[PDB]
Design a protein around this ligand. Structure first.
Ligand SMILES: *[B@]([O])([C]N1[C]=C([C][N]S(=O)(=O)[C]C(F)(F)F)N=N1)OP([O])([O])=O
Length: 355
């Protein structure tokens, strides 16, 4: 049966390279603590350099999972409460309309007035602080989800202040080591630059992510396929990790609210398992990703859960999914974006075929 994992990944992921002209791709499956890595094509077209276990890809919004885990770690070490407001930590946002929003609401996008992106004009630490002070409510706080890089990005920055280290050191010095990751970075160091893939835009130009305001917590992490499989392993099978980080991971798995069939946990999207294909696809629909939606309390607490998250930068696509009770998960990393629905579908066919 194990000798089917490669075949299935070949059948479902491999065709996407030709269909979308993707130079390179890494697909990982973990099943019953056993890892499978499938590499395709090139990390650099110009250099004729193959994707391999050393290839570093940009995770985009999948970084949000690390931010959430870092939040979970900080809560369980007593450094923050999800009930606190940013103003307790960012002394300067005190008494501003933002400081009626609590840390959970930010992490889970329900401030009621935050968009997918900051305005292009905002770049400096100084413009960031200004944006937040001037911020005013629109929807009743807590009531509406609009997916937002500023929302979780501020949560991210707050988690860092609470640990008295800049966000980058929180991940590189604390979170990544605890998860046993060897090649995951906020800032790819000089000795790894040769392992850093070019991303490729829709014009097949080589590109990498540009510095941006509160980028690290929102979409600024880079990682390898082995590291991401280790991250999924930790999610699937946490009891093995330091108690600190087991607690942090548990915290990211708890659903906070729903939007019909999608449960918002911390970073992760949660669903009842088995989920229909369209349930998974809907989490990534324009309605959900791009538009405000009123939430509801969790009514059905799913017995058996599965979790996913997509990620994108201008030249990179990412998807991660896991099902604890099947003890399986999948990671897809590309150095060109392909439609989210393509990622989700391919993963669905493979994980279903094995389990
Ligand atoms: B996250 O990856 C955050 N995200 C994605 C986008 C789409 N813009 S982009 O072209 O992919 C590049 C950018 F991020 F802007 F740098 N904007 N913010 O979100 P998802 O993958 O949708 O969950």
């Amino acid at each position: 049966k194990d000798q089917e994992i490669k075949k299935l990944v070949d059948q479902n992921f491999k065709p996407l390279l030709e269909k979308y002209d993707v130079p390179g791709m890494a697909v990982g499956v973990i099943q019953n603590n056993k890892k499978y890595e499938m590499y395709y094509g090139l990390q650099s077209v110009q250099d004729k350099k193959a994707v391999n276990s050393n290839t570093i890809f940009e995770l985009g919004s999948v970084s949000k999972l690390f931010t959430a885990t870092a939040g979970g770690y900080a809560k369980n070490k007593g450094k923050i409460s999800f009930d606190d407001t940013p103003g307790k930590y960012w002394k300067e946002l005190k008494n501003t309309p933002i400081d009626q929003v609590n840390l959970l609401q930010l992490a889970t996008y329900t401030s009621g007035n935050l968009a997918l992106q900051f305005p292009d004009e905002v770049q400096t630490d100084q413009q960031v602080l200004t944006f937040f002070k001037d911020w005013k409510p629109k929807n009743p706080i807590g009531e509406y989800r609009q997916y937002s890089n500023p929302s979780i990005g501020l949560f991210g920055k707050v988690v860092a202040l609470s640990m008295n280290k800049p966000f980058d050191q929180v991940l590189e010095k604390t979170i990544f080591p605890a998860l046993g990751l060897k090649h995951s970075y906020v800032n790819v160091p000089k000795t790894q630059m040769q392992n850093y893939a070019f991303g490729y835009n829709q014009e097949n130009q080589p590109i990498r992510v540009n510095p941006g305001p509160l980028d690290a917590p929102a979409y600024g992490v880079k990682s390898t396929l082995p590291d991401m499989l280790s991250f999924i392993h930790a999610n699937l099978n946490p009891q093995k990790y330091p108690t600190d980080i087991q607690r942090a991971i548990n915290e990211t798995h708890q659903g906070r609210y729903q939007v019909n069939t999608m449960y918002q946990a911390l970073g992760w999207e949660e669903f009842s398992y088995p989920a229909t294909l369209q349930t998974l696809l809907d989490s990534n629909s324009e309605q959900i990703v791009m538009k405000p939606n009123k939430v509801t309390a969790i009514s059905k607490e799913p017995s058996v859960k599965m979790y996913h998250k997509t990620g994108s930068t201008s030249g990179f696509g990412t998807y991660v999914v896991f099902i604890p009770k099947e003890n399986i998960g999948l990671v897809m990393l590309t150095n060109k974006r392909i439609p989210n629905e393509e990622r989700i579908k391919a993963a669905y066919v493979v994980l279903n075929a094995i389990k």
